[PDB]
Write an enzyme that holds these catalytic residues in place. Structure first.
Site, PDB file in Angstrom:
ATOM      1  N   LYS D 154       0.751  -1.233  -0.065  1.00 52.11           N
ATOM      2  CA  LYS D 154       0.235   0.294  -0.149  1.00 52.11           C
ATOM      3  C   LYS D 154       1.005   1.368  -0.068  1.00 52.11           C
ATOM      4  O   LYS D 154       1.049   2.099  -0.834  1.00 52.11           O
ATOM      5  N   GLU D 180      -1.573   5.932  14.131  1.00 55.35           N
ATOM      6  CA  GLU D 180      -1.558   4.892  12.917  1.00 55.35           C
ATOM      7  C   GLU D 180      -0.633   3.575  14.011  1.00 55.35           C
ATOM      8  O   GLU D 180      -0.646   4.557  15.597  1.00 55.35           O
ATOM      9  N   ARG D 181      -0.093   2.628  13.875  1.00 54.33           N
ATOM     10  CA  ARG D 181       0.809   1.962  14.974  1.00 54.33           C
ATOM     11  C   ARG D 181       1.636   2.534  14.764  1.00 54.33           C
ATOM     12  O   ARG D 181       2.805   2.506  13.524  1.00 54.33           O
TER      13      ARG D 181
END
Lengths: 487, 58, 167, 466, 66, 467
Positions: D154, D180-181
């Protein structure tokens, strides 16, 4: 000075507990310090639960609350015919402000029975499919329904463009003044849209009441009421109005939300209940009036975009039950490219006949029924396998006729063109052809008449209606033309 | 092809005048203000209109 | 029960729901003023901790807090129904809340017929005004004081900002 | 000015500021904050108390503790010096590379630009990815929402987008790692470095990274978006930019808001969702545009909440989407990186009335044909191509060429594609497929089209074989 | 000042000063100018680059009757 | 006694009465609102404050305003002069022809008439329309709810009934257009006017119209219900009359109640409801009856929200009824009007006794076949055919004929239908289907049965449909 002023008793959540100004005239839009208006909806004794127009970020508490001493009105006039405003009728066009400086309470009600007058009107859309199968008269609240600018919006344009013909014609009833209440429609969406309407120059007979995807919630909410006040002006001033509310889904959202934030519940679907009243109060004010109102109209085109075709959907159910029909558009068809895309089964004018145009009715009335069957066998019958020629034809023919109800967007028509192309199918001429050629035919067919059968068009136009004679001329046109049209 | 040629000029003179307006205006207002109160008579014109409130809103 | 009596200011009730009791109570029996002064007194008679701070100390038993804070002391000459309402706010913990009732109250026989308009600086200054006549101007003249830029400003009083505010 | 902790019920910190209550949105930095704990005024509750929000962590919230109004919303660097740099929400090197200075700092409330002020009429940002532009025309200033199979590059793709676009177009980039991580962003970090899309050496990367990961409290996670915006407007207008705004992942925004709402004594409407969902959304959406100068084009990683999109939230989102992207494993599996299934690469604004008809038609032909060919994938699955005629053979083959042709190699994932990537201007692109449609290259190798950006290199490549 | 027209004067003489500077009213200064320079240039990008102070002239031709 | 409006939070008007509170329900006239603002005392909120309800709306009110008790609940004009008129709650001429000059006045309240004072067991009022009577025969003086999504020709259908029936009926009728589109009411008016049954020359008619339209502020809509009742009661007992009571729509009524429930400071309910729904109804519905003094056959149109019946309100509703007309949205959706779900539209009132067994049985077989027939329908729907039983086929088809046979087009509304297809006097009805039961018809078409009347003619049509 601060003569009689009040302090924002509390603020949080855009709900201003306002201390003072106490004897506030109900539903006075008041003014806060911040420029910002609010309207003092809630009279609690010790404070005013104030719905804030504009937003609470700005706000600081104890702040001066001034009466504006004015009950919500919105500007009314006609100089907005030719303008884009925000809901408060203040521009956003940036041309400076509208010549319309009259104001009118949006707090108004839907006239009575005697004031009103029933329909018998046509009201032309230039969208063949529409005026024919969901035949339109003026004054009517009718649901435009479709799923995510599925051309939904497009429709409104073609009609508006069709009203061009009237406002650019001289119509004394068909001169439909368009009020476009844009609800929630992002600035881009609108900006964009407007840009077109102006191009369609339809803007001249057109108000755009604008609640984009930026507004304080009551503003979005309010926008229709604003529109509501105004359109009745035309209506009642004989003038014949068209309002597009697009869409109440968002308005309601804002409104419920508004309630919720007001920590007022809702009911069903998280929506409060007298949102029914909302739409009713809003929509009942769109009507077809007696003569006392100059006869005029405010034809209401509410738009609700189905959410996933869902309408059982309480609020849709509501709107549906209010509207005297719906035009459901078959979005997959849209997506199949089919523009129009309609779900005509799901498009109804329960009314039917008061709302039609004879020209068309003469071919279309008959056709609608005949199509009822074609369509019926389009759906009913459904295999691989053939039936009889009749029906097979009906399908073929029908399919041809299907193209005819399409209309590459932004291309409405005057009645004769519509009737014309229709005659060709109804009267058997283009059962023959194929869709690929229908579309072509029409183009040609139009240029043919455009050139030539302008006479005839003249006639059809004249009578507003067909004549066998005209037909006989037509008969010739189609046949001959048809022949020309291929070869 | 001609039009673009004139229109810059217009459109610049429009934008320029606003940018002179805002900058004039901002600098203008940001310089002179203060001397106003040393007219106590800016509170006398408050008192004046206020005495024509105070008689003349009753 | 009773029937509504409310000295000019009058109030909104609510922490003055009591006030309003005595805006009918004091008012009636027209020890309106007796108590009117009582209250005043009380205010500072109050203000120091003791058998009062007692309440704070949750663990002091309200039951006997009333019998101490009000037994010997708040009945020192605060009694009529006045100790009883003390003993009511007492129960009803509205003791820390009491000042505001006085506030609320005290605009009462005088200030009952106060002065309101919201007016620059040290604005109004609760007095009395008779709406048919002007009273306004007079006042202003009296003084050539207050602060009006720091205090209420030429923006209210005469729009310093407004000329800015159009653009 | 000062505040007192008057109440802590968690990060709803009831602060009494008693030197007036600065308008909601004002950032306060709480005094006594070792852990510089910013509170944003949320409500003026009165009592000179505001309800405020920690956008940070707490403890040692020794009561009455002193809180300082910054007199403004949170101020954060704006100006170009952010590129290549990772800041936390509160605009501070979580790149951990010392100051992410700029020149100008900005209070980050700044909302919904006037409709007239846009060039109210917006325009495709050319990605150059054939497929991309083609199937979902990407608009300068627009919101495109990236639904997509996980971890499929992605990011790889994205990095490449930065390369082609943020490079080839004047495109800049913002990465807002919203919720986000941290880890993936770490990984990614290295990836970016690695990809060279981010560079350290010079920090003249196209991207400033802003992360307001899971670690943040919702208000912070929620808010890292306005911040990111605040910069992007800076570049947009000021640097005239076509900013690419990677907002990654918007779902986390929604999530952040929604959470708070309840607690926030706000009915978080349907599905829990904050009643303002839209408004939140809107106010924000209105900041995403080609103004006059510059566009803030929002490249939106969009987690598909509950894979449900009627899902009121997505329903709303739809409004905000001009062009919608689902990245597809199906495609990916075909080795086609792009893994794009194109049918989910649309713009609602598709039409020939709108997305104009060669493009559209070629496309129409394409979606159709490919599908038709797909119909044949079922049909052929039975009948075999033998039982179909050459127009089918053709279509298949073409479809297949086209198939390959959507494949464009990658400099990044030489691991996935097998090699270094390209770039493809549109005229050539559409022409390319149109050409395949003309069947021109017979069915001279079609695997040639594999991982070739422009159509010619495949034609040529077909030849090197043939 | 609020003999209100004196606040117009308050502004106005600073218009009088500014317009009775050069460029008419200036003090906007170079920072304004870089801003100008972009949009004035950026205008040209939309709009073509030549005779914005003279008349553009043009040419007339054919390929073939295909 | 006087109050001053102390809090206005919408049309929930809080009036603090400064002295005596008359009991709850007193209609108050607001001193100021010339916009004849009746406040109905709703609660004695305590400390001489009442919650009162504006029927009306509110903009312009100064928080302050003086309210003077109208000293009673609503007094309304009653008697026959309300026939051929449009009354609102207050019986004002929405006829807009000036007053509805009566003798009689009324508290719009009325209560449940004694149980013994009722008639105990009623006798069938046949319903004409074949399908209808047949499966749902009614009781003269009955309360029928017509569940149906409004406006699906729903409304049309009721009108058509009215057409057939209300026409056929003599006595009097009371018509309440509540909450419905004023527009439709407008047309209808003219239509009645036209009909001259709304006599343009009788103050009366034979029918009184009472309206509590949607666009109104709630109280008005809400309360028009009591009003309408009062009148009809007036006619029923007093005029001894067989009243027909048409209500469109109780749904909006119920909704009105529910809507307020919250605002009323009460809890709303499940789905938001009025939790008092039941008591409201119980008492109300019990206000309704056919006593001895007259009979009110009340045909009550029921918009059923999202057609959810399940939906507690309708769940309740059922109690109140003794005849339910449950319309099938699907059938309606097949265009098929009749559209009813008749295995859901019910009367236990069908009888081998009362309706004689023939009818009855014929129906039982029908109800049955159909009931079975649906069950499969779905299975088979996807599960296609034949590796099965074709006797089933026979029923299916038959069911379908029957199905179609229930259908009768909207005779009158050629505007909607263009089609006529008549009413079937009962024996012919029984006969009709029975004949289908005799299944002779079965080699015949299917739409022959569709949208018609007398089976003979249908048969005729069958043949004809067979070209």
């Amino acid at each position: 000075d601060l003569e009689e002023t009040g302090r924002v008793l509390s603020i949080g959540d855009g709900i201003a507990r306002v201390h003072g100004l106490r004897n506030v005239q109900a539903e006075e839009m008041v003014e806060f310090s911040s420029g910002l208006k609010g309207m003092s909806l809630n009279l609690e004794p010790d404070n005013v639960g104030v719905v804030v127009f504009g937003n609470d970020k700005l706000i600081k508490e104890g702040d001066i609350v001034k009466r504006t001493g004015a009950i919500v009105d919105v500007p009314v006039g006609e100089e907005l015919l030719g303008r884009v405003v925000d809901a408060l009728g203040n521009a956003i066009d940036g041309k400076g402000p509208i010549g319309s400086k009259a104001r009118r309470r949006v707090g108004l009600k839907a006239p009575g029975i005697i004031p009103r007058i029933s329909v018998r009107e046509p009201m032309q859309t230039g969208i063949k499919a529409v005026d024919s199968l969901v035949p339109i008269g003026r004054g009517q609240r009718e649901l435009i329904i479709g799923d995510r600018q599925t051309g939904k919006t497009s429709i409104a344009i073609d009609t508006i463009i069709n009203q061009k013909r009237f406002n650019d014609g001289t119509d004394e009833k068909k001169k439909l003044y368009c009020i476009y209440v844009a609800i929630g429609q992002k600035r881009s969406t609108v900006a964009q849209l407007v840009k077109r309407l102006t191009d369609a120059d339809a803007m001249k007979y057109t108000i755009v009441v604008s609640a984009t995807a930026s507004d304080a919630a009551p503003l979005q909410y309010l926008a229709p009421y604003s529109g509501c006040s105004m359109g009745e002006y035309f209506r009642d001033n004989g003038k014949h109005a068209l309002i597009i509310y697009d869409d109440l889904s968002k308005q309601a959202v804002a409104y419920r939300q508004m309630s919720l934030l007001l920590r007022r519940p809702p009911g069903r679907e998280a929506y409060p209940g007298d949102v029914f009243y909302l739409h009713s109060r809003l929509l009942e004010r769109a009507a077809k009036m007696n003569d006392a109102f100059g006869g005029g109209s405010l034809t209401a085109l509410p738009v609700i975009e189905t959410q996933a075709g869902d309408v059982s959907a309480y609020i849709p159910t509501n709107v549906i039950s209010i509207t005297d029909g719906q035009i459901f558009l078959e979005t997959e068809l849209f997506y199949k490219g089919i523009r129009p895309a309609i779900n005509v089964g799901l498009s109804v004018s329960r009314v039917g006949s008061a709302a039609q145009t004879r020209a068309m009715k003469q071919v279309a009335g008959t056709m609608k029924l005949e199509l009822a069957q074609y369509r019926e066998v389009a759906a009913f019958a459904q295999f691989g396998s053939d039936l009889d020629a009749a029906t097979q034809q009906l399908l073929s023919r029908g399919v041809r006729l299907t193209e005819l109800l399409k209309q590459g967007q932004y291309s409405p028509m005057a009645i004769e063109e519509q009737v014309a192309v229709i005659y060709a199918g109804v009267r058997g001429y283009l059962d023959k052809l194929e869709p690929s050629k229908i579309t072509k035919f029409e183009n040609a067919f139009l240029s043919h008449v455009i050139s030539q059968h302008q006479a005839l068009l003249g006639k059809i136009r004249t009578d507003g209606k067909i004549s066998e004679e005209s037909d006989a001329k037509l008969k010739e046109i189609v046949t001959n033309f048809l022949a020309g049209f291929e070869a | 092809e001609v039009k673009n040629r004139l229109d810059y000029h217009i459109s610049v003179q429009n934008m320029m005048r606003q940018k002179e307006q805002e900058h004039m205006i901002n600098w203008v207002e940001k310089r002179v203000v203060q001397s106003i109160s040393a007219q106590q008579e800016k509170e006398t014109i408050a008192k004046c209109i206020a005495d024509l409130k105070l008689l003349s809103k009753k | 029960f009773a029937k509504l009596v409310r000295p000019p200011v009058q109030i909104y009730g609510i922490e003055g729901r009591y006030a309003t009791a005595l805006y009918s109570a004091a008012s009636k029996q027209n020890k309106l003023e007796q108590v009117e002064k009582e209250l005043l007194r009380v205010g500072q008679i109050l203000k120091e901790p003791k058998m009062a701070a007692s309440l704070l100390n949750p663990y002091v038993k309200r039951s006997v807090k009333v019998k101490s804070l009000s037994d010997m002391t708040a009945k020192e000459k605060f009694s009529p129904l006045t100790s009883n309402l003390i003993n009511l706010l007492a129960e009803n913990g509205r003791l820390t809340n009491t000042p505001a009732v006085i506030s609320a109250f005290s605009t009462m026989m005088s200030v009952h017929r106060g002065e309101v308009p919201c007016t620059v600086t040290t604005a109004s200054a609760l007095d009395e005004t008779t709406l048919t006549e002007l009273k306004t101007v007079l006042k202003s003249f009296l003084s050539k004081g207050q602060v009006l830029k720091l205090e209420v400003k030429i923006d209210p009083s005469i729009m310093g900002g407004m000329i800015v505010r159009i653009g | 000015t000062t505040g007192r902790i008057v109440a802590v019920i968690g990060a709803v910190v009831d602060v009494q500021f008693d030197e007036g209550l600065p308008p909601i949105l004002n950032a306060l930095e709480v005094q006594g904050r070792e852990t510089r704990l910013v509170l944003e005024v949320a409500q003026h509750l009165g009592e000179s108390t505001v309800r405020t929000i920690a956008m940070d962590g707490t403890e040692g919230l020794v009561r009455g503790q002193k809180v300082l109004d910054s007199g403004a919303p949170i101020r954060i660097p704006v100006g170009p010096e952010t590129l290549g740099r990772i800041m936390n929400v509160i605009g501070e090197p979580i790149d951990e590379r010392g100051p992410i200075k700029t020149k100008q700092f900005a209070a980050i409330h700044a909302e919904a630009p006037e409709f007239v002020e846009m060039s109210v009429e917006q325009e495709i940002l050319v990605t150059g990815i054939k497929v991309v532009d083609l199937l979902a025309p990407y608009a300068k200033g627009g919101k495109i929402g990236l639904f997509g199979g996980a971890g499929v590059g992605k990011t790889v793709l994205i990095m490449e987008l930065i390369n082609n676009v943020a490079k080839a177009h004047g495109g800049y980039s913002v990465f807002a790692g919203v919720g986000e991580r941290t880890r993936e962003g770490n990984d990614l970090y290295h990836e970016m470095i690695e990809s060279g899309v981010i560079n350290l050496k010079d920090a003249t990367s196209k991207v400033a990274l802003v992360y307001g990961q899971m670690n943040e409290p919702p208000g912070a996670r929620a808010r890292v978006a306005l911040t990111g915006l605040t910069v992007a407007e800076y570049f947009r207008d000021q640097e005239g930019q076509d900013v690419l705004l990677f907002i990654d992942n918007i779902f986390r925004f929604t999530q952040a808001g929604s959470e708070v709402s309840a607690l926030l004594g706000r009915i978080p409407s349907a599905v829990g969702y904050q009643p303002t969902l839209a408004t939140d959304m809107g106010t924000m959406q209105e900041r995403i545009t080609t103004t006059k100068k510059g566009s803030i084009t929002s490249v939106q990683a969009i987690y598909v909440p509950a894979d449900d999109l009627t899902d009121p939230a997505p329903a709303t989102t739809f409004a905000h989407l001009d062009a919608t992207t689902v990245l597809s494993r199906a495609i990916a599996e075909l080795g086609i990186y792009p893994a794009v299934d194109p049918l989910d690469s649309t713009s609602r604004i598709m039409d020939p009335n709108i997305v104009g008809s060669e493009h559209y038609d070629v496309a129409r032909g394409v979606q159709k044909i490919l599908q038709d060919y797909k119909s044949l994938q079922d049909i052929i699955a039975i009948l075999g191509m033998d039982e179909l005629s050459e127009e089918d053979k053709l279509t298949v083959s073409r479809a297949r060429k086209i198939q390959r042709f959507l494949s464009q190699p990658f400099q990044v994932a030489e691991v996935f594609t097998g090699h270094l990537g390209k770039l493809v201007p549109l005229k050539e692109t559409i022409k390319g497929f149109q050409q395949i449609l003309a069947g021109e290259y017979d069915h001279l190798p079609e695997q040639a089209f594999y991982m070739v950006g422009p159509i010619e290199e495949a034609v040529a490549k077909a030849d090197k074989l043939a | 000042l609020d003999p209100v027209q004196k606040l117009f004067v308050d502004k106005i003489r600073e218009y009088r000063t500014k317009r009775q500077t050069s460029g008419g009213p200036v003090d906007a200064g170079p920072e304004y100018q870089q801003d100008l320079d972009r949009e004035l240039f950026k205008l040209k990008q939309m709009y073509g680059k030549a005779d914005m102070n003279t008349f553009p002239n043009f040419t007339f031709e054919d390929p073939k009757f295909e």
